[PDB]
Design a protein around this ligand. Structure first.
Ligand code: PC
Ligand code: CA
Ligand code: CA
Ligand code: FE
Ligand code: FE
Length: 305
């Protein structure tokens, strides 16, 4: 305690984050996995853009880091949303580690208004529910007020955008993409604050709404890897006013190519920005101290090699 490990991608964008406090371990998201549905089960039909590439898989880096840390137990796994590059390794983790619970908001294909954004989502969701039932791992889907503040080693954690919002009948409210449903975590320890918002976007107003409620932080994980079209809205960055942005991506901020204007804007504001992308190390690690964040990535063994 107290450290945050952002598992590095080889290529593309994917989130797996390990929180380490005192001697406790937890995960915020789990990264993309080898498995995917092929359409042999019509519940999970093939659809175009389901991820298949081993170059985008984080499975081996996640499991190697956990083993290198002598993890015996995860106190929780928090899942931000159902996309495979976030929920992907949950059932593999549930099958390997003791886990005391999982935070997983409700999902249904029916609540996504675009058929071309269903992909893999349900397969991943249903892997969590089925595997957690087989292992007796408690799944918190109806997160009370609640529930949404709580204590993890030395870390104080506050959740946002955690409710299952319903229509009448209710039925989950319709959204354009599961990104807008992203479960947000703010972690506070040693006088520092870290925002972790999955693939939060502003398509249904979530950045406009939660920016002012979250307020000032020190370290911000970029929303949705690198996108500046529908995420990482300037009002949202100014609300959080982070000293450091970490991207779980090998790409610079991106809107029809490198958003050089946006990259320049961050430098002008004095915001440092780093990519958690590597061929040499499993994670970009910060030590979270009273004095600031120290990048201790090179203090771990490299990937063999
Ligand atoms: C689910 N997916 C991996 C096929 C699409 C990409 O997800 P996103 O990171 O752009 O929301
Ligand atoms: Ca997968
Ligand atoms: Ca899996
Ligand atoms: Fe993603
Ligand atoms: Fe996503």
């Amino acid at each position: 305690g107290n450290k945050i490990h952002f598992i590095n991608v080889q290529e593309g964008g994917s989130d797996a984050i390990i929180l380490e406090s005192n001697g406790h371990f937890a995960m915020v998201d789990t990264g993309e996995d080898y498995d995917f549905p092929d359409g042999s089960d019509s519940r999970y039909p093939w659809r175009e853009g389901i991820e298949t590439s081993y170059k985008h898989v984080l499975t081996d880096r996640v499991f190697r880091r956990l083993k290198e840390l002598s993890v015996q137990k995860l106190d929780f796994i928090l899942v931000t949303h159902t996309h495979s590059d976030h929920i992907g390794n949950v059932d593999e983790l549930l099958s390997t580690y003791p886990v005391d619970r999982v935070y997983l908001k409700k999902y249904s294909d029916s609540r996504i208004t675009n058929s071309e954004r269903l992909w893999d989502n349900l397969y991943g969701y249903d892997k969590v529910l089925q595997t957690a039932t087989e292992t007796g791992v408690s799944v918190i889907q109806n997160i009370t007020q609640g529930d949404a503040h709580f204590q993890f080693g030395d870390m104080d954690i506050q959740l946002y955008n955690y409710e299952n919002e319903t229509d009448s009948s209710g039925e989950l409210k319709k959204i354009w993409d599961d990104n807008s449903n992203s479960l947000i975590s703010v972690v506070k320890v040693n006088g520092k604050k870290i925002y972790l918002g999955g693939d939060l976007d502003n398509v249904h107003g979530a950045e406009d709404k939660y920016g002012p409620l979250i307020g000032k932080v020190d370290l911000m994980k970029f929303n949705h890897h690198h996108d500046t079209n529908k995420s990482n809205t300037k009002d949202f960055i100014k609300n959080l006013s982070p000293s450091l942005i970490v991207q779980t991506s090998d790409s610079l901020p991106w809107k029809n190519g490198v958003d050089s204007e946006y990259v320049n804007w961050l430098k002008e504001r004095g915001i440092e920005r780093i990519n958690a992308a590597s061929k040499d190390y499993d994670a970009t690690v910060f030590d979270i101290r009273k004095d600031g964040f120290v990048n201790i990535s090179t203090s771990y063994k490299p990937i063999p090699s």
